[PDB]
Amino acid sequence: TSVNSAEASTGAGGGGSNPVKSMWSEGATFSANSVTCTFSRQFLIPYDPE
Amino acid sequence: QIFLKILPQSGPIGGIKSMGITTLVQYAVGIMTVTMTFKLGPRKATGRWN
């Protein structure tokens, strides 16, 4: 048997759930005497084998 | 007597063909810890020389 036996069905691996909320914080907030500038970037740090 | 068994889990039924009825292959392990207290009598006093 195979899950492919139903042509409109996909296999499912039952992964985990993580109901966290986080912010993407970006933008300049100006004021009379200052500006607060926020930027966000995704970063990646590679696998280093040695 | 402490009786143990694994709760049987049904395998999939639905749009997949030819499934029949199955059970999930599952086994259980764990640690049985048994604590037994024994009452101990004192040794009898000995009058012997030897």
Q: Is B44 at the interface with chain A, CB within 8 A?
A: no
Q: Is B16 on the interface with A (CB under 8 A)?
A: yes
Q: Resolution limit in angstroms? A: 2.2
Measured CA to CA, the distance from residue B50 to residue B46 in angstroms comes to: 10
Method: cryo-EM
Q: Which of A1, A3, A4 to mutate to test the interface with B (most CBs of B within 10 A)?
A: A1
Report the alpha-carbon distance of residue B17 to residue A2 in Å, rounded: 8
Residues of chain A contacting B18 with CB distance shorter than 8 Å: 1, 5
Number of separate helices (H) and strands (E) present in chain B:
0, 0
Smallest CA-to-CA distance from A38 within A49, A23, A19, A21 is with: A23
